[PDB]
Symmetry: C3
Subunit: 338 residues, 3 copies
Amino acid sequence: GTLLPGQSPDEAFARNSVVFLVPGAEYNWKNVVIRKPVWIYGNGATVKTSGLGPIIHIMGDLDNPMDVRIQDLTFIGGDSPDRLVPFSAVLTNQMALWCIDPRITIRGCSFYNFGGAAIYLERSERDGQVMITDCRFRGCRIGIANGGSVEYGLASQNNFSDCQICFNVVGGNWTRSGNVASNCRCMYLHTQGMWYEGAAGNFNPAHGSFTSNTLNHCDYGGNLWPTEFQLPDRVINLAGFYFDNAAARLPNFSGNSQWYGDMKLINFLPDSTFVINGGALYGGPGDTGVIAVATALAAKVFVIGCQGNAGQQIVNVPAANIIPEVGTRKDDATQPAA
Amino acid sequence: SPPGTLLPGQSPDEAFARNSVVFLVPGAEYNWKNVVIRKPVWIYGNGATVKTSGLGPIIHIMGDLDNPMDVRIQDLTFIGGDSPDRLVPFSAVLTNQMALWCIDPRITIRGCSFYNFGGAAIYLERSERDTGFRFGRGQVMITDCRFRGCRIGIANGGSVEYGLASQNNFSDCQICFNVVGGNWTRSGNVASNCRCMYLHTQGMWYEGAAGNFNPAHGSFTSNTLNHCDYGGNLWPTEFQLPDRVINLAGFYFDNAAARLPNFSGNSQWYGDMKLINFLPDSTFVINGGALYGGPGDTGVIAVATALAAKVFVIGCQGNAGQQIVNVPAANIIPEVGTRKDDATQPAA
Amino acid sequence: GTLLPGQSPDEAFARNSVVFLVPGAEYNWKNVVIRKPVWIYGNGATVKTSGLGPIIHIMGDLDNPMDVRIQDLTFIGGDSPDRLVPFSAVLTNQMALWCIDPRITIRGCSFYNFGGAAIYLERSERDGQVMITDCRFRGCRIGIANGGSVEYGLASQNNFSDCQICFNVVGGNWTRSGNVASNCRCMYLHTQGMWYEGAAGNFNPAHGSFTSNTLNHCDYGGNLWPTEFQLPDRVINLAGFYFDNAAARLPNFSGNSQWYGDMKLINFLPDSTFVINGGALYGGPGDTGVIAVATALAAKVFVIGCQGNAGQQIVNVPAANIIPEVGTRKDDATQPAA
Ligand SMILES: [Cl-]
Ligand SMILES: [Cl-]
Ligand SMILES: [Cl-]
């Protein structure tokens, strides 16, 4: 199972349970199809592409115990992004890994300059143990997009730099821990009518775990991507952490650092509360790194065990729910805007 | 054979004895039974599968902590059967049905899978009780592993200490962490449809030669324990210990002579909890948790009335149907769920 | 590249992008130089050395997207450490890896008995996505030293035994999560005039994330390394967590165990607060595992959601800042001493 540059990756994956790339070599792949579980040992190779993606389309089989596994592999989606081009349906095609019904492990890989999601995971029908760790993302529209009913995955110890949206979140119950983002407009996005919902749609969404993450310089002092983001049927204004869905609950949120990590809690299920727990909230001067909740749900939001500076604004959360005192608190019913 | 090669049908015992590093045939199927490792070796699984037969374990690892080389096993699947009978009472004979039995472990296990073990998939013990001031011997790491259909995931006996069990995924196991040995870090693990993620009490299975010594008091952070008592788990609540029966919970602690781990950043959607007894010179906090339960008595968190003043619930979110029993209202900041007193809870 | 013991490492690294070592074999390398990115597959090998270090000198290129990667390799700096000799400028040379302008991944490696920092990362000018995970450190003066402007790294799931200073922290914005330390005098050090600041100096320091870590038996237990530590211009008295810089901010601190994990918060930037969040704080009998904050900054320090025993001492933190009540609290203007 040794796959040379120029040989058909499709043939090699069909013929072998495990494939080893030539160490450090350069590949050029386009619309590869994986139909049964295969392990790839990338050996520090690089996979380039051109034209409409994805680079690999992975047809899953959740009954089969053997996962698809990709280790130690670089994927390049092309040159540096034009970050001003509006996102579109045709650009959603520009993926590294499009995975349906995924039982998959992605470890120690790098993803550079994808026009859409570097990694997209969807479910063919509504109802895996997915793991994405130690990966690097640079210059990508979206880092990892999990569609509805892709649940209970783990994305941890990954580094995101210069990505518009790190986690395009739909499917529920993922653990996202120990991840670093800098100069990314959005680390966490969840709302209705997203891209990359997949065949199960926007079902049992979000409500997972977001711990020990850093989202720095989202809205100020490094990020280059636009705030305004085109969904399929409306335009929104992203934030480092953006949540707008009255029919969904937020994830558990503890141990995270926000240095210009602006946050907008626009709407969530009324039978819930939310805590910004054990966090570091630094912002200012001016309206930079602002944290804001919908006035109608502010009594259900708390800021507990947080540290911060005077310049960090907290908008609409009542004073009684901020223990201990952190930043500067105010009421402004114009915030947060969608 | 070539050095470092091990084909199916060849002797695993002989290959490990003659090599410091062994590479398996990529993707191949192996069939191994009562294999003995007597010195440190690394195994590169290369996506292989190992099946077995009879009373296990598949590998018995005789560790030497004075040797600085770890036994390292990577990228290897272990299968202990077709699918679990979940109704059989657990027993002394079933404790044999292990993948890895490790004594005095200096070990790294990573990228591995464990399916349908009748006992603990991984059992770690000491040949003797460790009362030295050389702490955390072995520096054990178990990470990026998947467990499913297993009676017990990882069992760490007395005096196997300061291990790390992180970024693992447990599906359909009765007890993920059978906890005896103290000071382990367990972080960022995902459990779904497992009756119990964390068990510690007196008179446990898998205590090893050191016994129930210096137990628990570790770190338990950023973990998810979902659908433990409702809406997914299929294993029985009733669980047979060597000398008594208990009723498991997602998190079960009953030991007057031991302290609970640090507990912060954990998600509990039907992750029931029973704090039955712990050492009095201690406090416990459910810190920065997500506590979702209801309707009815589903996902219930309960503390013994005698010790309730020592338990706090700080920085937690949750829904109305989440019950929190016996913890005083003043100890819950901010308010979460529906608080109640009930001196009959928790039962053992 | 299959590099054998006795062959020239330098020439091997210059001619291949990826190199595989002989599995299990012993190597002896001294002042090896890496000038272009390269991956080393260690295969459970061991690298010994002699004379003035470092073992490998790695010249980084931050513009090249291929990282330098070292996996599954053991580095040995001696048979056992010399712990009581005063630290010095010449001894700073006794390193495994010296990394200038690093884009580096170190995974599953082990580091034994280094007289300076096992791993030293520095920046050749003031302004990497660096990752150090699943590594073992035994017997080292210093585990990981990150210089100024070496930022946004990740050091996680590492284990430290019998090291003087696990993390010599200068450069800002690191995520350090899920690491275990026993019998190490100090897990986290940050002050002014440190060793290993690097050409960029003491710039934009610390203020990262320190979550889910264990720092046990720092001042009581089996630790052999002196509390007295020679900096270039003075001697300090180490603790488990040591912070003394009026011009820098502390990291976010959540989910950490401190069983005889003494802590000294001596000075930090006034425009900030600090929380010991979600902690386990166990100490005593006597003055063991003591946590103390400078009286002038005490009102900015909180202890939120922590558990402990009676013998844990918390010094100068006001009673109103400790929620819930944990351990034994007192005032003493003489602590912390530097
Ligand atoms: Cl989520
Ligand atoms: Cl524990
Ligand atoms: Cl820091």
